[PDB]
Scaffold this motif. Sequence first.
Motif, PDB file in Angstrom:
ATOM      1  N   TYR A 123      12.831   4.975   8.195  1.00  0.00           N
ATOM      2  CA  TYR A 123      13.096   6.075   7.279  1.00  0.00           C
ATOM      3  C   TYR A 123      13.202   7.384   8.058  1.00  0.00           C
ATOM      4  CZ  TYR A 123      11.708   3.090   3.309  1.00  0.00           C
ATOM      5  OH  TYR A 123      11.583   2.059   2.382  1.00  0.00           O
ATOM      6  N   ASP A 132       9.712  -1.976   5.186  1.00  0.00           N
ATOM      7  CA  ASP A 132       8.857  -1.517   4.089  1.00  0.00           C
ATOM      8  C   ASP A 132       8.658  -2.654   3.087  1.00  0.00           C
ATOM      9  OD1 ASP A 132       7.421  -0.048   2.204  1.00  0.00           O
ATOM     10  OD2 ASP A 132       9.022   1.431   1.851  1.00  0.00           O
ATOM     11  N   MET A 134       6.963  -4.175  -0.465  1.00  0.00           N
ATOM     12  CA  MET A 134       6.497  -3.609  -1.736  1.00  0.00           C
ATOM     13  C   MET A 134       6.526  -4.646  -2.823  1.00  0.00           C
ATOM     14  SD  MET A 134       9.936  -1.356  -2.254  1.00  0.00           S
ATOM     15  CE  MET A 134       9.709  -0.587  -0.650  1.00  0.00           C
ATOM     16  N   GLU A 180      12.342   7.834   1.963  1.00  0.00           N
ATOM     17  CA  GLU A 180      11.526   6.676   1.608  1.00  0.00           C
ATOM     18  C   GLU A 180      12.201   5.955   0.459  1.00  0.00           C
ATOM     19  OE1 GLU A 180       9.000   4.535   1.176  1.00  0.00           O
ATOM     20  OE2 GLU A 180       7.572   4.946   2.770  1.00  0.00           O
ATOM     21  N   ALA A 181      11.648   4.814   0.060  1.00  0.00           N
ATOM     22  CA  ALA A 181      12.247   4.025  -1.016  1.00  0.00           C
ATOM     23  C   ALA A 181      11.211   3.165  -1.735  1.00  0.00           C
ATOM     24  CB  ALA A 181      13.356   3.158  -0.461  1.00  0.00           C
ATOM     25  N   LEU A 228       5.435   5.918   0.244  1.00  0.00           N
ATOM     26  CA  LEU A 228       5.736   6.076  -1.169  1.00  0.00           C
ATOM     27  C   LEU A 228       6.108   4.723  -1.720  1.00  0.00           C
ATOM     28  CD1 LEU A 228       6.359   8.113  -3.679  1.00  0.00           C
ATOM     29  CD2 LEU A 228       8.689   8.111  -2.771  1.00  0.00           C
ATOM     30  N   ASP A 229       5.249   4.147  -2.559  1.00  0.00           N
ATOM     31  CA  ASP A 229       5.507   2.815  -3.141  1.00  0.00           C
ATOM     32  C   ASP A 229       5.126   2.792  -4.604  1.00  0.00           C
ATOM     33  OD1 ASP A 229       6.794   1.121  -1.361  1.00  0.00           O
ATOM     34  OD2 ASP A 229       4.963   0.160  -0.650  1.00  0.00           O
TER      35      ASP A 229
HETATM   36 CA   LIG Z   1       8.117   2.575   0.051  1.00  0.00          CA
END
Ligand SMILES: [Ca+2]
Length: 256
Positions: A123, A132, A134, A180-181, A228-229
């Motif tokens: 990122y 990442d 999640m 982020e995602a 960020l999740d």
């Molecule tokens: Ca994330």
Amino acid sequence: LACGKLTGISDPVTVKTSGSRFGSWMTDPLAPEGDNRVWYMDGYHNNRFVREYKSMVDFMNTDNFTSHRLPHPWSGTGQVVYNGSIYFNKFQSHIIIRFDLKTETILKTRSLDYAGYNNMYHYAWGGHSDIDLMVDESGLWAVYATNQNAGNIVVSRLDPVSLQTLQTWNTSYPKRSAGEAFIICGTLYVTNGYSGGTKVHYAYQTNASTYEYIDIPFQNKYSHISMLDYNPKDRALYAWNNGHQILYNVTLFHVI
Ligand SMILES: [Ca+2]
Ligand code: NA
């Protein structure tokens, strides 16, 4: 359509001020009611220590915790805790590891085929955040990129036991341009940066293989976001904000 489409992100809620600039924190979305333990991972580079706090209120009001030491160190801040296991990217590899917290042992190890690693497709914030992991309403995912997708974000459903890939989608979004995602109801949401001006400005809907440019702004209170999740149980976004652990509530729109 039933499950929901993101329409709004709340004001950031500061839960704790602690740890280094970069890290991750999370709860287990398949922990039984009301196992509300908080799992906490300071750092992005060659680190092994996971903190376990007894509850959200113990996390906020104390500095008492159980420590776990991973037999392999992680890269980045993209870990996820799921059904009593911690899933993470092995330091300097595209190896994914399932570490069982009940037995305190590694249960599974597997290469994430073709995934870039070691700050190849981080990122935008950097920090070896190439891969990442999640969890959403339907299960485990990996968000990464490959040479074959030209450095654009690749999304794969992941089996939580075998760690094998179940299905893969290639997006149009350059991972290194993404702050982020996170995934809500099978839709990948990607942010425009890690310090704006921040907003969700791209959605990729896996059930339709379609993306859209959108605009769902959210407040970056402490000026740097490195994690960020989404959590499907909590229906919240967990974030690491420059040495602050914060929560956002979200609103989803539903069509039944
Ligand atoms: Ca994330
Ligand atoms: Na993650």
